[PDB]
Amino acid sequence: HMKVTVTTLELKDKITIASKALAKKSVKPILAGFLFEVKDGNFYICATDLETGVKATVNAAEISGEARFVVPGDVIQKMVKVLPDEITELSLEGDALVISSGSTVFRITTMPADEFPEITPAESGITFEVDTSLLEEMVEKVIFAAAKDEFMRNLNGVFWELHKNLLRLVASDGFRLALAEEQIENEEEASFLLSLKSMKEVQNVLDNTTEPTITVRYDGRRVSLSTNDVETVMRVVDAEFPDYKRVIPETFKTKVVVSRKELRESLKRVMVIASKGSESVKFEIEENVMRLVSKSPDYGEVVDEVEVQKEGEDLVIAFNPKFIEDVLKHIETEEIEMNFVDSTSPCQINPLDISGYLYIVMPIRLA
Amino acid sequence: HMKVTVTTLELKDKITIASKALAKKSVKPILAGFLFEVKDGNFYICATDLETGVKATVNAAEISGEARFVVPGDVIQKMVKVLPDEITELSLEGDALVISSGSTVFRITTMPADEFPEITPAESGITFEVDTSLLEEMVEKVIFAAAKDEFMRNLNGVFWELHKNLLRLVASDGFRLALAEEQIENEEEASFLLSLKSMKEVQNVLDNTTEPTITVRYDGRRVSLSTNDVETVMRVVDAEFPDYKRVIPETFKTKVVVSRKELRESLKRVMVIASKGSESVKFEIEENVMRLVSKSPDYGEVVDEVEVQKEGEDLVIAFNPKFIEDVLKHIETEEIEMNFVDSTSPCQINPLDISGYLYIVMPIRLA
């Protein structure tokens, strides 16, 4: 005996929410599956890779019996997205989970749960509530700049800094950096690094909750991010995030104000040549215009000249254009500023007249 | 001296049109480029891979001088799609093509044209005009079923059959077949096979002309497809297209009428399991319903039951579901028919009550 009646939308939502905490195929195939647990009229779906764990309480209409088993993560995810009816019925027949919805019946072979661990929340520590939409926005404005190389433990993630009524998120890959800061309600100071994999689950949670605010708790070792129905717990990265403030310049010698669309389009034009091999654009900043230049030995050259408002010194300075383009994608204002010191110094990019968001791109050596 | 002034839209259109006649990087890098030729106040852009050739006349505002050179195909294609101004100016500086448009200047290294061949049209033979949109539609309704394996010379293409006031196109890959037939104005009988690569250029031409009809001429060895400004010539495939009529059954024992959306959705559900390895769906056709069944040894089973109108015998029969799904994508009616003989015989799929279009899928062995 295990029987569950649940709306298909609920099952789909809870599976989706848990899905980015699953492990890969290798290193415990068991951890590449969801734990389904039915006990005492409660139905939980869990996933973990041992660094992030998610325990989702499923709000069902009927729950009887007792069961604890694992089902393969990929198949169950694909399956729930195509169940055709408003209601879904779950049961066991032999060693199979039987999933019935309308016209369709899936029978999915279960795995043992005896090595699937208990997922427990962070202990008492530092806690705050934040507006769900605000935190989502902050995460999305920085997460792209994190190192994708998991070996770079100290950059493969997003750094959280809390102060009195203030949260800042920072991410970097050593070539560029994104920073977001917003006023919130928070009592205590704290900071921690969460892995990129943990952060993608954070984003997944936020993109799939309708609740107005969420709770965060940090105990020195783990961070819980909780909604009404979903507990997510993440072990903090055991690495020291770089002293990133040393790459954020305190003054400028050159400032350029330029249309975000205008520069994006110019970057696209020069990438026709830059993508061929140089992976470089040289900015020649003059009083009223900036020329963007890219050269490929074997294919050709491009020069594109764009109108700008510029204060300070004329400057010739080179960048990876993809890194500049990534920033522009994440800025929402029509105009941006680019702030420079020297050909060898970082550039700060920010939205015009909007505080709280800033980007740093390191330059490349001039050809 | 070579100078050309042309609208950017014109240059873009003619480059795009010629682009699918280019050869790959290997085997004459020269043939992976466009021929630009300026002579006597005419500007032509050409491309060939020695089986398909395209000669596009560019309608420019100003053309002076004389030049004949090749430019690399990928870069020029990317470049023209991002020129920012209504007008584009072309000239030579050193061994470079200089392309100036608004704010942007590209300088692209040219290659020698002395080994780029003359592209000439088919000789007198069989000729007809066809409505551009009609032929486009016919091509799109069949081309997906062609063999993608170039070694299968006799199936790697689309077969054209002309009769008095009638054109039929056929494509097959040995597992499935698509056929389209429409009334046109045509005097003589003829048939020929054009390669899949040639046919993709045909489609490219049709998708990029605004002219109401196009001309086709066949001389026994080559087929020209001509618009006002663009001559495309293709060498016919030296292979015998199979006697495909032997897989088109003349009668049915079972006919099923079913919603195209309904079956597409059912196929998607069973593919959750079929994509895991079996690549198979078993249809159990009964009086009022059809059950679709897929099984994976290691992951599970799915059964989906859909409402159908069925005449004739109950039947159990298996297919590759991707092949059924491909057909449905190309049918535009809300309802389709599936027509069967035996578990070992082809299935004919067609739109309900629409002549001129039909699909054949061969079954797979029952598990």
Automatic annotation (TrEMBL), chains A, B:
Annotated InterPro entries: DNA_clamp_sf, DNA_polIII_beta, DNA_polIII_beta_C, DNA_polIII_beta_cen, DNA_polIII_beta_N
Any GO CC annotation of this UniProt entry: cytoplasm
Subcellular localization(s) per the UniProt record: Cytoplasm
GO molecular function, one term: DNA-directed DNA polymerase activity
Highest rank taxon of the organism: Bacteria
Domain DNA polymerase III beta sliding clamp C-terminal: 245-365
GO biological process, one term: DNA strand elongation involved in DNA replication
Keywords noted in UniProt: Cytoplasm, DNA replication, DNA-binding, DNA-directed DNA polymerase, Nucleotidyltransferase, Transferase
Entry-linked Gene3D superfamilies: DNA Polymerase III, subunit A, domain 2 (3.10.150.10)
Domain DNA polymerase III beta sliding clamp N-terminal: 2-119
DNA polymerase III beta sliding clamp central domain sequence ranges: 130-243
Pfam families: DNA_pol3_beta (PF00712), DNA_pol3_beta_2 (PF02767), DNA_pol3_beta_3 (PF02768)
SMART domains (UniProt xref): POL3Bc (SM00480)
PANTHER family named in the record: BETA SLIDING CLAMP, DNA POLYMERASE III SUBUNIT BETA
Described function: Confers DNA tethering and processivity to DNA polymerases and other proteins. Acts as a clamp, forming a ring around DNA (a reaction catalyzed by the clamp-loading complex) which diffuses in an ATP-independent manner freely and bidirectionally along dsDNA. Initially characterized for its ability to contact the catalytic subunit of DNA polymerase III (Pol III), a complex, multichain enzyme responsible for most of the replicative synthesis in bacteria; Pol III exhibits 3'-5' exonuclease proofreading activity.
Record's subunit section: Forms a ring-shaped head-to-tail homodimer around DNA.
NCBIfam families assigned: dnan (TIGR00663)
Family indicated by similarity: Belongs to the beta sliding clamp family.
Protein name: Beta sliding clamp
Source organism (scientific name): Thermotoga maritima (strain ATCC 43589 / DSM 3109 / JCM 10099 / NBRC 100826 / MSB8)
